[PDB]
Amino acid sequence: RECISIHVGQAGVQIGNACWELYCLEHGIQPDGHVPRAVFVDLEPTVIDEVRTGTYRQLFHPEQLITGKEDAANNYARGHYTIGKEIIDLVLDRIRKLADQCTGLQGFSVFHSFGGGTGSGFTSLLMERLSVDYGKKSKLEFSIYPAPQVSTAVVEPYNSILTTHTTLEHSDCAFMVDNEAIYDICRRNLDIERPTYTNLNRLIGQIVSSITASLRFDGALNVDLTEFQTNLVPYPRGHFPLATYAPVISAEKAYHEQLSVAEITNACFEPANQMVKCDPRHGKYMACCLLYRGDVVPKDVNAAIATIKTKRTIQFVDWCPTGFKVGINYEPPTVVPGGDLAKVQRAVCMLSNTTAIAEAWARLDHKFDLMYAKRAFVHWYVGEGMEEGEFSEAREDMAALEKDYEEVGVDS
Amino acid sequence: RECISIHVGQAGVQIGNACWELYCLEHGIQPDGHVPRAVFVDLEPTVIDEVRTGTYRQLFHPEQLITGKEDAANNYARGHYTIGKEIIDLVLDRIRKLADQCTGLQGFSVFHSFGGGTGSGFTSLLMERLSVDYGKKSKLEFSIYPAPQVSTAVVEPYNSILTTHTTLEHSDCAFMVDNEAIYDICRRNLDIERPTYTNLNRLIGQIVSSITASLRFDGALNVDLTEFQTNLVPYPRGHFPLATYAPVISAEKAYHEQLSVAEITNACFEPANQMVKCDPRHGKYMACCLLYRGDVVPKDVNAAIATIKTKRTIQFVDWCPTGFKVGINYEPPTVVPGGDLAKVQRAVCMLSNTTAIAEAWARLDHKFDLMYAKRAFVHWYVGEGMEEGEFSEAREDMAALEKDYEEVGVDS
Amino acid sequence: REIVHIQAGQCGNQIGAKFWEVISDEHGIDPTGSYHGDSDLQLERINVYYNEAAGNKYVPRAILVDLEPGTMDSVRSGPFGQIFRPDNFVFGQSGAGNNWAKGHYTEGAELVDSVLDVVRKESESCDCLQGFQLTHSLGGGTGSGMGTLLISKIREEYPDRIMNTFSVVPSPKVSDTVVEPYNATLSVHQLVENTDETYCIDNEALYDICFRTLKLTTPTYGDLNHLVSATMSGVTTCLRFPGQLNADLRKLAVNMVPFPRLHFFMPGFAPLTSRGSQQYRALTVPELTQQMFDAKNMMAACDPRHGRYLTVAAVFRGRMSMKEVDEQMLNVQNKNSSYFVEWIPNNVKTAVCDIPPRGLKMSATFIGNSTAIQELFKRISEQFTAMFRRKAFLHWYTGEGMDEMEFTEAESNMNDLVSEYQQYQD
Amino acid sequence: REIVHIQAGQCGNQIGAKFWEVISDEHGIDPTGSYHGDSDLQLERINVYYNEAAGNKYVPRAILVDLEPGTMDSVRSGPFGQIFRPDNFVFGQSGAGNNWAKGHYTEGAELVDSVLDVVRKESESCDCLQGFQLTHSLGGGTGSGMGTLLISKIREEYPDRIMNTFSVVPSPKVSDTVVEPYNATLSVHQLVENTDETYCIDNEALYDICFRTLKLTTPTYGDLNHLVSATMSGVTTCLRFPGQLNADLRKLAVNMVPFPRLHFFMPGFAPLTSRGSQQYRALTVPELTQQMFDAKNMMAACDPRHGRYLTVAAVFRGRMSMKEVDEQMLNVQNKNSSYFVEWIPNNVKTAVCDIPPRGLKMSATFIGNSTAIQELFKRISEQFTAMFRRKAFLHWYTGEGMDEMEFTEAESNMNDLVSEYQQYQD
Secondary structure, three states, X not given: OOEEEEEEHHHHHHHHHHHHHHHHHOOOOOOOOOOOOEEEEEOOHHHHHHHHHOOOOOOOOOOOEEEOOOOOOOOHHHHHOXXXXXXXHHHHHHXXXXXXXXXXXXXXXXXXXXXXXXXXXXXXXXXXXXXXXXXXXXXXXXEOOOOOOOOOOOOOHHHHHHHHHHHOOOOOEEEEOOHHHHHHHHHHOOOOOOOOHHHHHHHHHHHHHHHHHHHOOOOOOOOOHHHHHHHHOOOOOOOOOEEEOOOOOEOOOOOOOOOOHHHHOHHHHOOOOOOOOOOOOOOOEEEEEEEEEXXXXXXXXXXXXXXXXXXXXXXXXOOOOOOEEEEEOOOOOOXXXXXXXXXXXXXXXXXXXXXXXXXXXXXXXXXXXXHHOOOHHHHHHHOOOOOHHHHHHHHHHHHHHHOHHHHOOOOO | OOEEEEXXXXXXXXXXXXXXXXXXHOOOOOOOOOOOOEEEEEOOHHHHHHHHHOOOOOOOOOOOEEEOOOOOOOOHHHHHOHHHHHHHHHHHHHHHHHHHHOOOOOEEEEEEOOOOHHHHHHHHHHHHHHHHHOOOOEOEEEEOOOOOOOOOOOOOHHHHHHHHHHHOOOOOEEEEOOHHHHHHHHHHOOOOOOOOHHHHHHHHHHHHHHHHHHHOOOOOOOOOHHHHHHHHOOOOOOOOOEEEOOOOOEOOOOOOOOOOHHHHOHHHHOOOOOOOOOOOOOOOEEEEEEEEEEOOOHHHHHHHHHHHHXXXXXXXXXXXXXXXXXXXXXXXXXXXXXXXXXXXXXXXXXXXXEHHHHHHHHHHHHHHHHHXXXXXXXXXXXXXXXXXXXXXXXXXXXXXXXXXXXXXXXXO | OOEOEEEEOOHHHHHHHHHHHHHHHOOOXXXXXXXXXXXXXXXXXXXXXXOEOOOOOXXXXXXXXXXXHHHHHHHOOOOHHHOOOHHHEEEOOOOOOOOOOHHHHHOHHHHHHHHHHHHHHHHOOOOOOOEEEEEEOOOOHHHHHHHHHHHHHHHHHOOOOEEEEEEOOOOOOOOOOOOOHHHHHHHXXXXXXXXXXXXXXXXXXXXXXXXXXXXXXXXXXXXXXXXXXXXXXXXXXXXXXOOOEOOOHHHHHHHHOOOOOOOEEEEEOOOOOOOOOOOOOOXXXXXXXXXXXOOOOOOOOOOXXXXXEEEEEEEEXXXXXXXXXHHHHHHHHXXXXXXXXXXXXXXXXXXXXXOOOOOOOOOEEEXXXXXXXXXXXXXXXXXXXXXXXXXXXXXXXXXXOOOHHHHHHHHHHHHHHHHHXXXXXX | OOEOEEXXXXXXXXXXXXXXXXXXXOOXXXXXXXXXXXXXXXXXXHXXXXXXXXXXXXXXXXXXXXXXXXXXXXXXXXXXXXXXXXXXXXXXXXXXXXXXXXXXXXXXXXXXXXXXXXXXXXXXXXXXXXXEEEEEOOOOHHHHHHHHHHHHHHHHHOOOOEEEEEEOOOOOOOOOOOOOHHHHHHHHHHHOOOOOEEEOOOHHHHHHHHHOOOOOOOOOHHHHHHXXXXXXXXXXXXXXXXXXXXXXXXXXHHHHXXXXXXXXXXXXXXXXXXXXXXXXXXXXOHHHHHHHOOXXXXXXXXXXXXXXXXXXXXXXXXXXXXXXXXXXXXXXXXXXXXXXXXXXXXXXXXXXXXXXXXXXXOOEEEEEEEXXXXXXXXXXXXXXXXXXXXXXXXXXXXXXXXXXXXXXXXHHHHXXXXXXXXXXXX
């Protein structure tokens, strides 16, 4: 029934504090109410401390807040092997102590930031140690994969080609939200050149609320977590769909809010609104899980979608007749009291697997090579319990992820 | 009906003052009320004096407070033979003067600290002289055996391989509480790097309250002292079970207190909560006496235990179908007004014989050899009325305690 | 006689709320209240759907099967939601995944025994059992998979009592799900081989019939459901009323199924006029047959005009002349001799209750067994292949312990089912 | 006629408080008060359980045997606790160790004479003695050992008067003790050879029957006990009431025990519906037999459906038709001819009191002698061997003056007892 969550890496923790905020906010549980149902991991104390100093301070147990005073290191190796190792046990312990206390759970919603040290590496083995300790569950990892041109870390790809290959054979469904492609939404669909990280977080903090929160919440067309991976992954590769939200209108500027279904659903497939720089440049969808929430008439949907199924310029895979999982919830969304999110009475958090990422992965793989081609910051990992193996052998890994996402599509 | 108690050795006396404190505390008998029912022995005045100067000063009779102004000596020999001898008579006298005054007693809860001078030696002959003067009773000795790595005395093992062999053929059931493995609980399950001895004492001072106090106290499933040894020792070796407590939560930090039975019972078998560095590294339980107290529904137990009986990873001995003595009391625990103990409305003081100590004894025996192998501080005992005999012949003793605790298990 | 409704899945469930919303009023049973019945006749036959315990509490004898709590917890937390004895709620807090395989082999298969248990407690209620009503959608997990199992088990336990199935076959134009043809083809398969009377409804055949035959501009689901529930009341419950010429599930079955497949029908209600205005009362009777027998007005997607009929059952329920009824039916059978199949001299099965739908003067449920429904299983079957060919979202099935030969099976089966049905259109 | 209850051990004791809590109200006897009886019939037969001294003080004629003070000092310090004459309390302040051997050979053996003393003071009370009621648990000292002795002595003192035994056989799933099979196997042994009517109850068969047949979410012990005590009231006390066709311990015994073992039964109550809602009143009668004869609802652990019956005794107590009673029983005997053994043309022993359980309209205690209980002594017997083999916690027995041949004895005996019972299942 439940779904634990492990927010790993400063980012996964910032986003965590955010997604965790939106929660109580739409459940009437102020600062000090019940008890969360997740954990927080980081090898840099000062960040988890922000959850220990700032807002939502006492809504957590100093037990579900793991820290390694030591060093973060923007390098996979160190975070996965060398350092990150020391903490893992302890980490697990909570996701085994928190996993027990419950009643027939469904899985762990993992929150990490692909291209980091504590986020890429660590998790790599966290999800790793999970796939074995609970192979019998769902492993949906919600990632924030590398901005297409606006990356931060100098190494980023090293850290992301490595978190992909190690987690690939362990996740159930990996959701993806592109940090940059979300900015566009903040520039083009909300207008603000002042987007603090605290915003992107409010956003995913939204799209995510549509996943677990409301879905695990009764409705006219419930959709379990398992449901996802089933209706969402055509193949064992921990396939990565993309998150998209519909009423991303500004709560100040424009106001046409009352945008009946027929509109908000069409607003999902236009590439300029998908929290991912993977513009459907060719990527044929192969399965979409249209999660609606608020006042929505099933016919409105079983029509708004019909209209789409016949737009053709939206070309769905061949081997897939119908790939539209319509998830209907009741309670409308719940916008921050005064952030910058419109606040409509219905939304569409549609996520999907698109042959599109054939790109995004490509463009991120290429990156890697360029540097590896010169070993660049390699000495930083080797000296951290890794080898020419793990790199070269994780490169070959993704290689067959560029062929995979190619074969499962583009061909009939 | 009753059970006298002889707190021997400074420690056994500190722990005594503690266990003795918790008592009145949950019986509404302030500083000056009724009359205890035990005695205090030590060959170092200044310590028993602490019971004569400090708190619970007038709650005792200067008659049940035995002291030998002389010298303690952190050596068995001296305490058992040479010095300790002189006092014994007098000591006995009280446990014969206090044993008479009562009405059909059941035994003497002895409190000693294995690796001491007055605690190891002395008692050795105290329990010794008891097994003969009242063979017809219970001799449950509550020990605080040698910290696995954090011992104090330099000789400790000499003193503990000697208190074991001499008491072995005299005790009924020897309870064991590991000083170090209790610290962990103070670090990991209560959080405090400031644990004064006065705390560990509050703890055993708790687990012990669950033994005598409340048990000898009416309830829905009473358990007599005899009951123990019967349901707890499979074989004449004064077998040593381990003490464990369940709601060892902090009365400040976390607060999930309301942790229904189903939880507190599972919290007993996780090795990080057992007042003994004998982690069930393999030791198959062979009998557990789950003493519950507070609001507990017999079905809750006769279910919470059922769930356990089928966890298998908790492997019980072969020759033992069912080894679960469910002891239910009414009155919930009673935490110090403002120490650091949570204060729940139900607890589980489960004690048991585990093939685990096969370890603890091993690791403590080995110690001994190393030193004996060089005679180390041998001249300190010899010159105190002992011989190459008592050592070598008490070593061979435990040897068959390493084989015993091995044979009664690991085999089918 | 008796029956025991079955609310499989959410849809089948959502509808339960509407089928019982109605039926009750058509039997004067308030939430937990008793029989307030404006009359005295809405009681002598209730048993068919309730049970006697208190003396004011006649509880609906249905089953609520679903692997998604929130749903039944919306039906149980709203209006009439508090009339079902909790024992009726056979939930599966598991992940009610949208996979036919997840609710038929892996997740549902567990919750089944705890269902059959009750389906027996209700069957062994009292008197004599007739059959079970089954509501669900063939486009999801708890619906097509788990509900299609519930029957395969029911039909092994009482191959005597009947099995009406109310399926919400995947609407054409737009599919309210993606694997739809997967969850569907797989459930129709189970249907063609267990239940012996199926009434296929189409969310979009309804909209139409609900937005143009009821100037209704905002047809919420509640409505669609409501309209449907209107038909299933005319069918069953109705005939369990007096009549110059009454029938009952069997008659309906033994007059409508020429060949054992089970065959699926297409229900149609009679007075379907917009509120105020339209209240034309042109309901003498030629007006009802006018209605019922037109293309639009067939809850099905397909249009009768696109294929002969094998059988028809105008189950009227309102005082009328066995002459103006028996007569009309004829001209109708002659004006359209073209499509009405010939090897059956009298395709039509005229049925006639007495008391009409509570507030109406004259109505008539239509249960058509036309060969037209060929052009629907075709549809479904097509969608399958077009996506099966590429094994589209197949990993969500297999990965749930399924078979590559299972899908083959169903399609073929249900695909052949299309074939046969044509054997009569010719 | 008369009887003298016996509260052996804590459990048997705890239950005493519930058996007397009930029974009294079913006889209008307030704490120390007298007969407030809403009627006048709840008095002409009380004697069976009380004694006349004052004129408002009818004191329960039971025995409270236990080696743990705190217990009886909880039963005597609470509600009805102050109605037992202190003479009744035969305590053993000793160490009530959880050892069968400690309460049967070493510790209990002493307290015995001071018990028999009273069991005679009560027997030689007045009029004519029928038998003694015995409550206890076969999973402890004061219960299985000392109580199993109390009877071995009773049955030597009056091999004429009967001996009903209410045993709380060790529940499966989870054992509320560890040596359980030790204390058990050893007591069943004593039972199969002294008492001649045993009613085995299972703390978990109750939970179930108490958490699903009574939506009761927090079934405290008090409850379980309460439910049990409900059955033992229907049995005895009840039949000591008028009836179109009344029976009494013997009838019950002389109709239920085909072969001298003593055989153990499995009690089942009739109206077992959740409070508010469920209060369906579907209690015409087919509803009671519906109840009583189902699997769940058998206080035993095993399920009847897993083995024929030898005898059955529906001891109803509420005005009904000797026709709708005598009749129902039949169909029941024919719908399940499969399991009901054949060499007994009429297994069932219909019994019929008049006055029902104080606040209810119609009830019926069920006392089944099914061969199914084979699959329980099996259980117990298994647990033994698996642990006996290694002499697990045996030192607590022997060290108490026991024998390595004693355990052998019991197991075998009780083990053979399993054998025999199968001799009829076939």
